[PDB]
């Protein structure tokens, strides 16, 4: 006689969208490893670290519905005077001060993190499309050591 | 023969609203784990700790009814002179003193906890929207060790 | 010398049952967070909202005593013509009208809230079993805004 | 012209103690959900069910006043021959027979419910301390189905 | 033949009001567990303990009738010199001395317990509203151990 | 002198089973990211989306006890007419309609979500074994945009 | 025409400590998934299962205040003769017997669950520190199948 | 003076086996780039694309323990009628239809993806052994453009 | 005595396209070793290093379907004023500044990295076709030493 | 009119350090594939398997700040008698016994896993520096087949 035991649980996460493309499963909750940055490279305000690239992949694109796609990021800004700099948020202690994360468009332009200002439009082709971005650290002062983790959501506009 | 025994009770909680969006079930009552903070980071008044991000998810958004959403938080302030600092409340003993909780906007601005001063408006898309916030500890003096638990309710304004 | 002071009180709640399985401590009294629902989704009678899943966990199951389990829910119906829709009950004022809670079986069929009509039988395995259910809002008319809280007890039948 | 109506009443419950620690507001009157237990598990005297853990939280502990804390529980024993078994009590009818509740301390030893025999001492740290316990059903014979509710008060000894 | 026996009695408590909102059934008569407090935290007059939060919920709010709501608490003061401190009352013996309960506004300001000095007004939204408050112990001298129970009635002003 | 402060809490979850294999810790509560799907790919009933693979890993397998393993999934069906289609459940609002999740066996056959109909048996080897599965979206009508989250438990049969 | 509706509630949990480091928000309350274990691996007393690693992260460490950190765990022991074995507690039924959870030091030594016997000290660096641990199942007899859930709180000693 | 900072984490993955050979580190988890294939090469059922070879390397082979080795692959089939065709799985959208991946033996024979039908045996020499294989696209109908990613695990049999 | 052990996993990567040609498996994801370049060759804006050639190979070309092929590259530009220069992206630190990668057509003309400005058309022959490119470093200012890694995706046009 | 849909979430991980070098993004969290090892190569205690090398890359090194770098690893030891061998930790079942992972220095010396015993200092040049390391399996007895996964965090010291 066979032996039957309890197993576990499987959670399925997904979304149904009425749009020309569908975001790839690996690009909806991706994690970008920025690495470590020295405080000597963020000594004063306006100092930028090196960039780390990341992609947002669109699947099952149909050019008849739409020909261009744009991405707008949404997140908590570091302060009112820096709308284009993400705020670090990992825990109540241990986070770096006067440091933020800047998301750069494919044209090298900073993106406002309001979820309304969309990036430059990219021409789409049928099938799989990759939208390139890169992120870097931005200093609004004299950086102090600590953890630098940031979170941001994005929305895709099809034209 | 079948055997029937008393099983238990199930309680359903929810709300019906006349609005452009509906708050997600995971956002109507959520716990934000701030973590521990050292007293050395809250030695004097105006000292702040590192931020912890939390989001309020809006489901079934219809942009034809409203295109913007704002959130105003309501809670007990630590004192009259600090209307934007939440007051710690867990028990009659063991709570930290001269330190509160600040809820920061998506633009990095502190929010008044009166339930009338709403945050910055965020553009809404059809379907799911994720309004970002972050919370941090704010010292109104020399903070002393103890538990730091705070509670606040929020309203959503659609325009 | 030792200082002895009064502490408090501890209340133990439980049940001894002559049955093949025992309901888990987390399932005898659980709160299901349905979330918010827009009035636009309950404009007319027969309209349903999105579903929220909840589980009833059975512990110490012995397949030699019984191989199948069924659950029947008992609650106050919204009206005589709808003996499958739970009536909202939180207070004398502030509750939503023309809308109730429907409990859906693991086959997607609505369950009669009379405590006698049991759901479909589910095969049991030795040890832990997790019976899945589904809850959603059901409109018997044009719903109006207000709190939507409902309660229902359940009983388990072992065969 | 404002309208003023009668709102209701608020009752405040608490205690002022002269001790090294203060019991948390969530631990002065707490409900422990044991769940359901099968009669097949409690078939003869000495049979025990599975354990359900619960904690007594101490706040504002001052190590310089006392370094150790112990807890003694007080309740009605099931009979004279079983001083470590809590008697079930809820209503004149419907309670289980030949089964009680046993309280075990951090070392796994059953505690006498006389309010004088204290559990093993636990070293205290400054601030919040959590004293762990667990409860289980104990059979003094062939258990019969029924409700199993027990009540017990505790006192804290600081050394 | 059916058997009919006497059951019991059901008492319904409520109130009909002519106001913009109705107090929730869970807020008209609620119990606030403050927990325990050490005498070392109330050694001299003016010393305060940690705060415990409690809420007054308003249902069926109509903004078109009134937009603001305030709460005034009424109770017995500890003495003529401390009109903002609630007096303890549980029995003729066993109550703490030189200790009282202070009810704090959402702005952190102590409320006069005369039933005429209303709290700060809070903006009301249509439907459910939650008015936050804090409760804490206040020392008018050297605190002595004992039970600390207080009672206060409140009234709501709609403007 | 050393400084001791309160830390936190650690919760251990697991199961002891009498079976030839034990489910790996990474497979008991795994989350499967399906990604986004366009409504154009689910225009009518019977339409299927692309599949996403996931695995259930069995550890410490002993071929002397059992040589084959099978998995049966248990969940709430979308309706009585589609017993092999999982129902979406995330919140009361914002979920896709007429869309479900199908779990596909290693032979490409859809599995009935009743917890009794097991998949095909897979030959086991000593040590680690990986059971492959597939998940995809199934349309029972004309799909509408919204969140698509599904939950299902499974049990393993060793023969 | 702005529309304002009730949202929900946000609960903030945290602690203010006077210590060289602060426990990370992800480590104050974490869940360790041990997975399933076969009864054949726990046939007699002294038998152990495979270990599952977990970490306690310390943030904002200041080496000038303290150079070493140690962790002591506090929980209910399985019995008097096994002070280093955690007792299983999930419900009154369905828990495994004669098997517990052992917390292992970074040197591979079992830790006493009394909250006083601290682990080996670990040298701290400025910023983030990760203290490694692993947990495993320990049999005090012939283990029987069932749920195996354990809970333990920990303290951090800075010296 | 030395400066000490937190570096990062390293994960080690491997297996201990009781076998005559051990799979190379580069063969336990390898990616095979199949390239692109035109839809015009998979117009009807049974059409095959060009093949791409891949190898499984066995290290530390001992001919005194076993002289031959065979490999059986395990994965999800495209359908019931094609047990030798691997199903594509990358995301819910954008995957190709009516086309799968076919794994070929060293004798040009298709392998059943059930994990039990082992390939042809190959003579082993002491030291390093390479087992050649071939992968290609197989059409079960009219192939449509899209991403074509497949995953399969393999077992090695020594006899 | 046949011994069976777990071998590992194999991942297959590929794409099905509807086009006159198919990209070689060696060209879908290739790494171009640019080598080292002295900062003395990139002193000012407009300075270029030596070119390193790389090819994109097309297979199974059908001249009947299409006779010409063009390639457009997509990547993150270094800045808005230089849309023809790729941005360096390897990590948050150690990357060169004021240096970028320029992809040159077979005619010696720099290609815009917008993913829509295709290169010069090249006549295709039946079978295998090679489309040649070359890459070089471009200075937008005074070059500083550091790692120089860039990534870019490309699309092929058959018209 | 453009269509806007919710895209997903992006998580950024990184650290800001006050040090002469920054760890590369690919080295802060890397996976080392040790491959498979035969039990015949770990027959008795002190037996070692073949070594698998891995590197830790340092970026933006400034020799004017520090000239030498050393790495110390931290992890759970297999036992108290072997404070140089990493303990295996993947799940409660299926892990190998009497065998661990040894991290070897660039001089061939095993490193203590206490997080304080640093490796040999390596001369640093400006720009990119790679610190070579080795990993192998160490037997503390008669190794048994099973999964062999280990985790260790490292830490860099600059002089």
From TrEMBL, chains A, B, C, D, E, F, G, H, I, J:
Highest taxon of source: Bacteria
Keywords: Fimbrium, Signal
Cited Gene3D superfamilies: Fimbrial-type adhesion domain
Location of the Fimbrial-type adhesion domain: 10-159
Cellular component terms (Gene Ontology): pilus
UniProt xrefs under SUPFAM superfamilies: Bacterial adhesins
GO biological process: cell adhesion involved in single-species biofilm formation
Location within or outside the cell: Fimbrium
InterPro entries in the record: Adhesion_dom_fimbrial, Adhesion_dom_fimbrial_sf, Adhesion_dom_sf, Bact_Fimbrial_Adh_Pro
Stated family: Belongs to the fimbrial protein family.
Protein name: FimA
Lineage of the organism: Bacteria, Pseudomonadati, Pseudomonadota, Gammaproteobacteria, Enterobacterales
Gene name in the database record: fimA
């Amino acid at each position: 006689t066979p032996t039957t035991v309890n197993g576990g649980t499987v959670h399925f996460k997904g979304e149904v969208v009425n749009a020309a493309c569908a975001v790839d499963a690996g690009s909806v909750d991706q994690t970008v490893q920025l690495g470590q940055v020295r405080t000597a490279s963020l000594k004063q305000t306006g100092a930028t670290s090196s960039a780390v690239g990341f992609n947002i992949q669109l699947n099952d694109c149909d050019t008849s519905v739409a020909t261009k796609a744009a991405v707008a990021f949404l997140g908590t800004a570091i302060d009112s005077a820096h709308p284009k700099v993400l705020a670090l948020q990992s825990s109540a202690a241990g986070s770096a001060t006067n440091v933020g994360v800047q998301i750069l468009d494919r044209t090298g332009a900073e993106l406002t993190l309001d979820g309304a200002t969309f990036s430059v439009q990219t021409t789409l082709n049928n099938g799989t499309n990759t939208i390139p971005f890169r992120a870097r650290y931005y200093a609004i002062g004299e950086a102090t050591p600590g953890a630098a983790n940031a979170d941001a959501t994005f929305k895709v506009q099809y034209q």
